[PDB]
């Protein structure tokens, strides 16, 4: 399941976008629209293990977050993204899952959607492709998070 949860200034998901078709059944049962980030994200994790996409013994959930400037003030989003990161891992602790959080950029966000990937899948795709791990966009469409992360572990060659 590749999901994009678009939140507003009050951390609630205004709209949820499936970047991959397997996310659609998850979002259906989750219903994260009009839901605060904590419960919404918890639903995505909860519903995915119930549908058998992940098992609780090995579930690395990837979280990537970018602040697409609809709020900024002057120095808000710097510490604001930290409020995001702390919630992403807190929900991962809630669900009892393992996590990898790679913060995304707005530039990265539009690259992700152009590759037909979620920012999570893409953030680690772009990591792996730099590491010398040969990933195709089709491999990124298909291979699991645990497969992509596992390849970084045994073959790490770049920053």
């Amino acid at each position: 399941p590749s999901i994009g949860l678009v939140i507003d200034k009050k951390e609630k998901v205004i709209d949820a976008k499936p970047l991959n078709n397997d996310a659609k059944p998850i979002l259906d049962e989750a219903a994260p629209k009009d839901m605060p980030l904590y419960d919404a994200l918890s639903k995505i994790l909860d519903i995915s293990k119930k549908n058998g996409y992940i098992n609780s013994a090995d579930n690395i959930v990837l979280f990537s977050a970018s602040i697409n400037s609809g709020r900024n003030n002057v120095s808000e989003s710097d510490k604001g993204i930290q409020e995001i990161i702390s919630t992403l891992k807190d929900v991962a602790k809630d669900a009892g899952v393992k996590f990898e959080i790679i913060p995304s950029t707005e530039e990265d966000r539009q690259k992700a959607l152009d590759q037909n990937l979620s920012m999570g899948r893409y953030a680690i795709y772009v990591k792996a492709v730099e590491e010398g791990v040969n990933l195709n966009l089709e491999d990124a469409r298909n291979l699991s998070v645990s497969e992509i992360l596992g390849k970084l572990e045994h073959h790490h060659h770049h920053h």
Binding site: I7, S64, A112
Partner: peptide, 10 residues
């Protein structure tokens, strides 16, 4: 709109 959280499972 503020942030996009893209979550990858499986």
């Amino acid at each position: 709109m503020y942030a996009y959280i893209d979550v990858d499972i499986n």
